Write a protein that holds these residues in place. Structure first.
Motif, PDB file in Angstrom:
ATOM      1  N   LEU B  30      31.410  32.827 -17.819  1.00  0.00           N
ATOM      2  CA  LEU B  30      30.024  33.236 -17.723  1.00  0.00           C
ATOM      3  C   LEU B  30      29.437  33.626 -19.039  1.00  0.00           C
ATOM      4  O   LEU B  30      28.305  34.053 -19.079  1.00  0.00           O
ATOM      5  CB  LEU B  30      29.855  34.419 -16.778  1.00  0.00           C
ATOM      6  N   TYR B  31      30.178  33.520 -20.123  1.00  0.00           N
ATOM      7  CA  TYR B  31      29.616  34.010 -21.374  1.00  0.00           C
ATOM      8  C   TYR B  31      29.946  33.247 -22.679  1.00  0.00           C
ATOM      9  O   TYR B  31      29.429  33.628 -23.729  1.00  0.00           O
ATOM     10  CB  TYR B  31      30.016  35.473 -21.541  1.00  0.00           C
TER      11      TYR B  31
ATOM     12  N   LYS F  24      22.124  32.671  -8.613  1.00  0.00           N
ATOM     13  CA  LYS F  24      23.154  33.645  -8.950  1.00  0.00           C
ATOM     14  C   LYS F  24      23.039  34.096 -10.394  1.00  0.00           C
ATOM     15  O   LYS F  24      23.229  35.272 -10.679  1.00  0.00           O
ATOM     16  CB  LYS F  24      24.549  33.097  -8.677  1.00  0.00           C
ATOM     17  N   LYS F  25      22.736  33.172 -11.304  1.00  0.00           N
ATOM     18  CA  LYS F  25      22.310  33.561 -12.649  1.00  0.00           C
ATOM     19  C   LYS F  25      21.119  34.501 -12.539  1.00  0.00           C
ATOM     20  O   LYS F  25      21.050  35.500 -13.238  1.00  0.00           O
ATOM     21  CB  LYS F  25      21.951  32.341 -13.505  1.00  0.00           C
ATOM     22  N   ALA F  28      22.295  37.838 -11.465  1.00  0.00           N
ATOM     23  CA  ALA F  28      23.085  38.369 -12.570  1.00  0.00           C
ATOM     24  C   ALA F  28      22.205  38.990 -13.633  1.00  0.00           C
ATOM     25  O   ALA F  28      22.426  40.125 -14.007  1.00  0.00           O
ATOM     26  CB  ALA F  28      23.938  37.281 -13.161  1.00  0.00           C
ATOM     27  N   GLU F  29      21.191  38.247 -14.075  1.00  0.00           N
ATOM     28  CA  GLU F  29      20.144  38.733 -14.988  1.00  0.00           C
ATOM     29  C   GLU F  29      19.415  39.981 -14.470  1.00  0.00           C
ATOM     30  O   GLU F  29      19.399  41.014 -15.129  1.00  0.00           O
ATOM     31  CB  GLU F  29      19.111  37.617 -15.265  1.00  0.00           C
ATOM     32  N   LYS F  31      20.319  42.145 -12.398  1.00  0.00           N
ATOM     33  CA  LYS F  31      21.223  43.285 -12.381  1.00  0.00           C
ATOM     34  C   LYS F  31      21.295  43.955 -13.773  1.00  0.00           C
ATOM     35  O   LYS F  31      21.466  45.182 -13.899  1.00  0.00           O
ATOM     36  CB  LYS F  31      22.650  42.856 -11.928  1.00  0.00           C
ATOM     37  N   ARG F  47      18.318  38.309  -3.444  1.00  0.00           N
ATOM     38  CA  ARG F  47      19.637  38.326  -2.829  1.00  0.00           C
ATOM     39  C   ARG F  47      19.557  37.971  -1.333  1.00  0.00           C
ATOM     40  O   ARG F  47      20.547  37.522  -0.750  1.00  0.00           O
ATOM     41  CB  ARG F  47      20.350  39.675  -3.112  1.00  0.00           C
TER      42      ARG F  47
END
Ligand SMILES: [Mg+2]
Ligand SMILES: [Mg+2]
Ligand SMILES: [Mg+2]
Ligand SMILES: [Mg+2]
Ligand SMILES: [Mg+2]
Ligand SMILES: [Mg+2]
Ligand SMILES: [Mg+2]
Ligand SMILES: [Mg+2]
Ligand SMILES: [Mg+2]
Ligand SMILES: [Mg+2]
Ligand SMILES: [Mg+2]
Ligand SMILES: [Mg+2]
Ligand SMILES: [Mg+2]
Ligand SMILES: [Mg+2]
Ligand SMILES: [Mg+2]
Ligand SMILES: [Mg+2]
Ligand SMILES: [Mg+2]
Ligand SMILES: [Mg+2]
Ligand SMILES: [Mg+2]
Ligand SMILES: [Mg+2]
Ligand SMILES: [Mg+2]
Ligand SMILES: [Mg+2]
Ligand SMILES: [Mg+2]
Ligand SMILES: [Mg+2]
Ligand SMILES: [Mg+2]
Ligand SMILES: [Mg+2]
Ligand SMILES: [Mg+2]
Ligand SMILES: [Mg+2]
Ligand SMILES: [Mg+2]
Ligand SMILES: [Mg+2]
Ligand SMILES: [Mg+2]
Ligand SMILES: [Mg+2]
Ligand SMILES: [Mg+2]
Ligand SMILES: [Mg+2]
Ligand SMILES: [Mg+2]
Ligand SMILES: [Mg+2]
Ligand SMILES: [Mg+2]
Ligand SMILES: [Mg+2]
Ligand SMILES: [Mg+2]
Ligand SMILES: [Mg+2]
Ligand SMILES: [Mg+2]
Ligand SMILES: [Mg+2]
Ligand SMILES: [Mg+2]
Ligand SMILES: [Mg+2]
Ligand SMILES: [Mg+2]
Ligand SMILES: [Mg+2]
Ligand SMILES: [Mg+2]
Ligand SMILES: [Mg+2]
Ligand SMILES: [Mg+2]
Ligand SMILES: [Mg+2]
Ligand SMILES: [Mg+2]
Ligand SMILES: [Mg+2]
Ligand SMILES: [Mg+2]
Ligand SMILES: [Mg+2]
Ligand SMILES: [Mg+2]
Ligand SMILES: [Mg+2]
Ligand SMILES: [Mg+2]
Ligand SMILES: [Mg+2]
Ligand SMILES: [Mg+2]
Ligand SMILES: [Mg+2]
Ligand SMILES: [Mg+2]
Ligand SMILES: [Mg+2]
Ligand SMILES: [Mg+2]
Ligand SMILES: [Mg+2]
Ligand SMILES: [Mg+2]
Ligand SMILES: [Mg+2]
Ligand SMILES: [Mg+2]
Ligand SMILES: [Mg+2]
Ligand SMILES: [Mg+2]
Ligand SMILES: [Mg+2]
Ligand SMILES: [Mg+2]
Ligand SMILES: [Mg+2]
Ligand SMILES: [Mg+2]
Ligand SMILES: [Mg+2]
Ligand SMILES: [Mg+2]
Ligand SMILES: [Mg+2]
Ligand SMILES: [Mg+2]
Ligand SMILES: [Mg+2]
Ligand SMILES: [Mg+2]
Ligand SMILES: [Mg+2]
Ligand SMILES: [Mg+2]
Ligand SMILES: [Mg+2]
Ligand SMILES: [Mg+2]
Ligand SMILES: [Mg+2]
Ligand SMILES: [Mg+2]
Ligand SMILES: [Mg+2]
Ligand SMILES: [Mg+2]
Ligand SMILES: [Mg+2]
Ligand SMILES: [Mg+2]
Ligand SMILES: [Mg+2]
Ligand SMILES: [Mg+2]
Ligand SMILES: [Mg+2]
Ligand SMILES: [Mg+2]
Ligand SMILES: [Mg+2]
Ligand SMILES: [Mg+2]
Ligand SMILES: [Mg+2]
Ligand SMILES: [Mg+2]
Ligand SMILES: [Mg+2]
Ligand SMILES: [Mg+2]
Ligand SMILES: [Mg+2]
Ligand SMILES: [Mg+2]
Ligand SMILES: [Zn+2]
Lengths: 206, 70, 50, 87, 126, 119, 50
Positions: B30-31, F24-25, F28-29, F31, F47
């Motif tokens: 993921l990074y 999901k990205k 993720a961002e 969050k 979500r």
RNA sequence: AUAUUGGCGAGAGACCGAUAGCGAACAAGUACAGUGAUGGAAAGAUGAAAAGAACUUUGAAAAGAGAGUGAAAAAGUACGUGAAAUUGUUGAAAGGGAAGGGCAUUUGAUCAGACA
RNA sequence: CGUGGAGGUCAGUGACGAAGCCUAGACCGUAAGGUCGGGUCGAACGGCCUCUAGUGCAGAUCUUGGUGGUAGUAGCAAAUAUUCAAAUGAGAACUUUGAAGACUGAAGUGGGGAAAGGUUCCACGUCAACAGCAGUUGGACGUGGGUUAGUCGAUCCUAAGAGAUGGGGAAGCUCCGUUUCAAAGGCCUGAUUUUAUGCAGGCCACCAUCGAAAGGGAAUCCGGUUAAGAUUCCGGAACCUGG
RNA sequence: AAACUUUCAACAACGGAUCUCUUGGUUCUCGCAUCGAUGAAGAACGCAGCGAAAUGCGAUACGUAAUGUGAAUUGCAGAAUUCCGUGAAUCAUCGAAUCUUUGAACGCACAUUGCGCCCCUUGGUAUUCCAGGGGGCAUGCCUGUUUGAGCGUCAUUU
């Protein structure tokens, strides 16, 4: 019947400087120590807890029951009695009040009220309606909120409309002659209802 | 935020179900980042903390603000 | 526990009798059900008698 | 010294937590639970202990599944989909 | 008199079903009768209130006032109007909660469905 | 915003999978953003969207299988009707209706006659 | 205690999280009747029994 | 056709009315005790509406005093009414080892009725 | 005489104030009680004929709750001990710092752990309750932060013991037996070069499993670092196991 | 004569009777037949923008899908396109899913987030070692399938 007894409380017996009723045991909670079971105890069982096998209904000799209903019918003539009972009949023509058999065929409330009036029931109809009060008791939240007087009892020989035309006017009650009922003939054990009879009804009587 | 500035290390709250393997791969994926090692621990609120050391080729601080936080 | 000139009685209430009291409060109810049943059954059974 | 100095040594557990009922009635040396009976297939309960039952019977919990059976019953256990209309 | 066997005159049951009625249920109890004029107009007596109808208070201390319903506070069983408010003491202003049975409707906000309702209730619309 | 299923069901198998990876990205961002902020309710609608996609991704795979088992003995137990355990083992209408050859002859020969009283 | 099963550590975690004052905004809720957190627990005054 | 202090849905009462009624009208089989089996409470009511007291002043603050809201603060989240024991203040009176009580009248206070 | 509910009635009372509560004010009754005024109050309630009962309290070492006198009373006296000043703060016998006088005296009032607790650790804020004087202080209250391992422990092993299993009892919940009158299993590779693992030798008959954070046991050290972690992090230098 | 004690009254305390209330309880009666290896009842831990509980739910976590309604939700913030609409809602209905760790509870254990074996797949130079992803392995019993045991025992080889 399980109430008051949902505990394992024993009496502490004597020698602890304290009355001998059972006491909730264990600790840590304020309930423990407290007096249990007995009728003088907060949360005890009551004395002689009411049972459902109490007598509710009562048996009366059929003939004696007739004697009663007859007397009560006899008395709905006799205008003093009818008058004594509430019942505003100072100004109806005659008693027994017998009205055209046509009454039984009235389908419309407004028409039925109109009739009763012409025949003289106006001050009684007004006396109900004029008398709706709130039940004074706790009764007024056990499905009995209002109170009021008793109207005239329209007896008929055949229901060709009249029970529903009349069924919505305050205090007016209907009966078929064949039945005929002491609770209505003498409301409250006071003789003297105001019956308005139809002809058909008046002669079925015999 | 200090381990990041001083220690070339990214701290993540991480799945309780995840192991050092799964944490390491997940960061890496993921990074872009390469991982030297992964220390972990259970916080006292039942959640897992991953101390992720990046290899010397990556500046974790640099990562941190290209992921967003600061 | 014996006195006066009374008839000697025999009320059998020495078991836990209170646990077995049948009160017919449903007398009224059963009768209706019993009626609705027969109305249901006369219907089902087409012209046949009951 | 049977009273408070003896209490001084209370620092070992007779029961831990019970996996099945979660209760700190799990007798370690006996490996069974004084409350729910585990690991017996059956659950402990007695008819002299009514409160005890009342404290644990169906209804005292989520009923994750049983909740819904009488909806499902009410509708004759339908399968398939709901269709559509207007408004 | 009630005549059915699936209706109940029980006061306790009644009051329960009021106070614990779901939102969808409250939409209907929160009805308002139409203005005398609208009632000829659509040929229809009353309607579940809704957030942009036009309305006249015809009971109570704000009797005579009018405005646009700005919320149906279904939770509080009460309807708010932009234009009928309390000036406070700090000069904040605060809505008065009014009861739709104490209003009268003066312009229905209309929908495909609103009309469909009005139709369904045997009325007509202009 | 928030994605709507009936549109997802027109999308393809791997449009949906990619939708998912986007959301999901997205999450993720968000969050990361959330903890630099007084509140962040957009996160909710993201979500619930991941929900919806998974729901609908799993929706189609299921009716794939359901159909190719349609009409054979034996299909996965989680496509078999659920009903009720007892129900599930009640006899079938067939098994129940089942009748002794001798019994049949009698049914046929002497059936319950319709009849009335009067004359 | 002091070197613990994960099962214990977990319960302890849940206990920590449970151990905060009534979040005041709830007081402002319509019909709210909760004034304060009435299930507060303190390590000194009351033991967890594991 | 019989049974049914369980379960799902309903209609009811000459039942109880917050120390009553189920133990629980409420975050009640909770909080809390106990190694454990088990034991197991207390606890409902501001007002139509928070309009829950802007502002000023004394204070370290809590608060007080004004103001203000309200039909009412003799309803101020200690909240409807708000008894008794028991307490403070004010007023009146009495009191040489208890106090209280009976019959009777002085004295003080107080009050009705009725004249016409 | 009085109370809760019920049938009848007086078309009874009431927001222009029901009920209740106060009242060395009035009136009727021998009495149980009844009636009124005034004050308080806020939504209901009474008279008559009848119906009905969970229907009348001073007592029960009665039940629950509340309250007194006792009384500003017993008391707050074990563990040698306190003192000056500054600073802070509304407020300082009690907090902080400096000074001084002492104490514990390494069989510690030191430095760490095991059981048990479970955040009490640390920082900031901070005093209504709590700390039987106080409080600006706190193991309190509010808000956050904090527990890093191939090598430390668990984990593996076996101890007393516990306990499935073919079985044998027992109406049965279950009891007995544990290698037990049981057909009790898995390893090294060869055979494969259709092809992946069937068979071809042969051994081994050992019969579960749980049970030690003090017993047995593969392997890590020094320096440095934090508000709070460190044989765990940083640094350097190693070592064990498997591949 | 004060103080003190005592009585009465006013105002104020203490306390929470009383009166009025009641989404509760109790008892009656009517209708109905539906828990679980297709994992039940029960447990544990989690899940909201801002929740400790109660209620709800399960890493799709105060909810996803479908359907009905037809514009809320509301303590605050918020979306904002959602209002003549495949569309609001802490709405109703509910037919489809998700359903951590567990429980009769099933690979073995369990005061352990402890320890195997099998299949498919992926990464690491790998049939064998390591890691990730998915799918599996309890017991009694019934019918059946396949592979077998026993001079229990029939026949047929030559
Ligand atoms: Mg009993
Ligand atoms: Mg005593
Ligand atoms: Mg009771
Ligand atoms: Mg009363
Ligand atoms: Mg009356
Ligand atoms: Mg750097
Ligand atoms: Mg670790
Ligand atoms: Mg004698
Ligand atoms: Mg008998
Ligand atoms: Mg006997
Ligand atoms: Mg019965
Ligand atoms: Mg017959
Ligand atoms: Mg002893
Ligand atoms: Mg003890
Ligand atoms: Mg022991
Ligand atoms: Mg045992
Ligand atoms: Mg088991
Ligand atoms: Mg159970
Ligand atoms: Mg309508
Ligand atoms: Mg309203
Ligand atoms: Mg939605
Ligand atoms: Mg099946
Ligand atoms: Mg202690
Ligand atoms: Mg029943
Ligand atoms: Mg009925
Ligand atoms: Mg009362
Ligand atoms: Mg109670
Ligand atoms: Mg009573
Ligand atoms: Mg109670
Ligand atoms: Mg209530
Ligand atoms: Mg409490
Ligand atoms: Mg009130
Ligand atoms: Mg109150
Ligand atoms: Mg209120
Ligand atoms: Mg003031
Ligand atoms: Mg007024
Ligand atoms: Mg007032
Ligand atoms: Mg007062
Ligand atoms: Mg008041
Ligand atoms: Mg205030
Ligand atoms: Mg008050
Ligand atoms: Mg005097
Ligand atoms: Mg005297
Ligand atoms: Mg005298
Ligand atoms: Mg009497
Ligand atoms: Mg009476
Ligand atoms: Mg009573
Ligand atoms: Mg007095
Ligand atoms: Mg008088
Ligand atoms: Mg007055
Ligand atoms: Mg009054
Ligand atoms: Mg009122
Ligand atoms: Mg009487
Ligand atoms: Mg009594
Ligand atoms: Mg007496
Ligand atoms: Mg008394
Ligand atoms: Mg007493
Ligand atoms: Mg006392
Ligand atoms: Mg003092
Ligand atoms: Mg003293
Ligand atoms: Mg002393
Ligand atoms: Mg000393
Ligand atoms: Mg000192
Ligand atoms: Mg000092
Ligand atoms: Mg010295
Ligand atoms: Mg010395
Ligand atoms: Mg020495
Ligand atoms: Mg010390
Ligand atoms: Mg230490
Ligand atoms: Mg501790
Ligand atoms: Mg500290
Ligand atoms: Mg203080
Ligand atoms: Mg303390
Ligand atoms: Mg103190
Ligand atoms: Mg103090
Ligand atoms: Mg703290
Ligand atoms: Mg904290
Ligand atoms: Mg080691
Ligand atoms: Mg291990
Ligand atoms: Mg055994
Ligand atoms: Mg072991
Ligand atoms: Mg060991
Ligand atoms: Mg060891
Ligand atoms: Mg060091
Ligand atoms: Mg650090
Ligand atoms: Mg340290
Ligand atoms: Mg190192
Ligand atoms: Mg090196
Ligand atoms: Mg090597
Ligand atoms: Mg009210
Ligand atoms: Mg009821
Ligand atoms: Mg019925
Ligand atoms: Mg909620
Ligand atoms: Mg929300
Ligand atoms: Mg639609
Ligand atoms: Mg819903
Ligand atoms: Mg999932
Ligand atoms: Mg097992
Ligand atoms: Mg596991
Ligand atoms: Mg077989
Ligand atoms: Mg064979
Ligand atoms: Zn258990």
């Amino acid at each position: 019947e399980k109430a008051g007894h949902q505990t394992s409380a024993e009496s502490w017996g004597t020698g602890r400087a304290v009355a001998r009723i059972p006491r909730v045991g264990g600790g840590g909670t304020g309930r423990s120590g407290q007096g249990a079971f007995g009728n003088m105890c907060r949360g005890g069982r009551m004395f002689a807890p009411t049972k459902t096998w109490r007598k509710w209904n009562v048996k009366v000799n059929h003939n004696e029951k007739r004697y009663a209903t007859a007397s009560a019918i006899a008395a709905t003539a006799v205008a003093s009695l009818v008058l004594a009972r509430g019942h505003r009949v100072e100004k109806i023509p005659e008693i027994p009040l017998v009205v055209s058999t046509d009454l039984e065929s009235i389908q419309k409330t407004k028409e039925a009220v109109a009739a009763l009036k012409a025949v003289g029931a106006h001050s009684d109809l007004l006396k109900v309606l004029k008398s709706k009060k709130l039940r004074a008791g706790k009764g007024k939240y056990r499905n009995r909120r209002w109170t009021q007087r008793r109207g005239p009892l329209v007896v008929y020989a055949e229901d060709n409309g009249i029970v529903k035309a009349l069924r919505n006017v305050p205090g007016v009650e209907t009966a078929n002659v064949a039945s005929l009922n002491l609770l209505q003939l003498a409301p409250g054990a006071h003789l003297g209802r105001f019956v308005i009879w139809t002809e058909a009804a008046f002669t079925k009587l015999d | 935020m200090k381990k990041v500035e001083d220690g070339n290390i990214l701290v993540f709250q991480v799945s309780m179900k995840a192991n050092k393997y799964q944490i390491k791969k997940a960061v890496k994926e993921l990074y872009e980042v390469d991982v030297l090692k992964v220390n972990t621990l259970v916080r006292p609120n039942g959640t897992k903390k991953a101390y992720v050391r990046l290899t010397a080729d990556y500046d974790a601080l640099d990562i941190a603000n290209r992921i967003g936080y600061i | 526990a014996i006195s006066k000139n009374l008839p000697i009685l025999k009320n059998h209430f020495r078991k836990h009798w209170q646990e077995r009291v049948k009160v017919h409060f449903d007398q009224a109810g059963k009768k209706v059900s019993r009626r609705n049943a027969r109305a249901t059954r006369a219907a089902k059974i087409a012209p046949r008698p009951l | 010294g049977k009273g408070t100095p003896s209490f001084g040594k209370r620092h070992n557990k007779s029961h831990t937590l019970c996996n099945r009922c979660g209760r700190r009635s799990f007798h370690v040396q006996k490996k069974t639970c004084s409350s729910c009976g585990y690991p017996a297939a059956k659950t402990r309960s007695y008819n002299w202990g009514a409160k005890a039952k009342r404290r644990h019977t169906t209804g005292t919990g989520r009923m994750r599944y049983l909740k819904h059976v009488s909806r499902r019953f009410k509708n004759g256990f339908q399968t398939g989909s709901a269709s559509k209309a207007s408004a | 008199a009630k005549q059915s066997l699936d209706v109940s005159s029980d006061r306790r049951k009644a009051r329960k079903a009021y106070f614990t009625a779901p939102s969808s249920q409250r939409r209907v109890l929160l009805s308002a009768p139409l203005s005398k004029e609208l009632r000829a107009q659509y040929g229809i007596k009353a309607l579940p209130i809704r957030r942009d109808d036009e309305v006249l208070v015809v009971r109570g201390s704000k009797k005579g006032q009018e405005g646009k319903i700005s919320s149906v506070y279904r939770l509080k069983f009460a309807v708010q109007v932009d234009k009928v408010t309390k000036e406070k003491v700090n000069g904040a202003s605060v809505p008065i909660n009014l009861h739709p049975s104490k209003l009268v409707i003066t312009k229905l906000h209309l929908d495909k469905d609103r009309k469909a309702l009005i139709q369904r209730k045997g009325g007509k619309l202009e | 915003a928030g994605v709507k299923a009936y549109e997802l069901r027109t999308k393809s198998k791997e449009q949906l999978a990619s939708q998912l990876v986007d959301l999901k990205k997205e999450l993720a961002e968000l969050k990361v953003q959330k903890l630099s902020r007084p509140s962040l309710p957009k996160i909710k609608t993201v979500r619930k969207s991941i929900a919806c996609v998974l729901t609908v991704i799993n929706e189609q795979q299921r009716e794939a299988v359901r159909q190719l088992y349609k009409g054979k003995k034996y299909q996965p137990k989680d496509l078999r009707a659920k009903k009720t355990r007892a129900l599930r083992r009640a006899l079938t209408k067939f098994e129940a209706s089942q009748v002794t050859e001798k019994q049949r002859k009698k049914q046929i020969a002497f059936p319950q006659r319709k009849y009335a009283i009067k004359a | 205690a002091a070197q613990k099963s994960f099962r214990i550590k977990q319960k302890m975690a849940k206990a920590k999280k449970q151990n905060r004052p009534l979040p005041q905004w709830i007081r402002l809720r319509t019909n709210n009747t909760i004034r304060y957190n009435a299930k507060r627990r303190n390590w000194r005054r009351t033991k967890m029994n594991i």
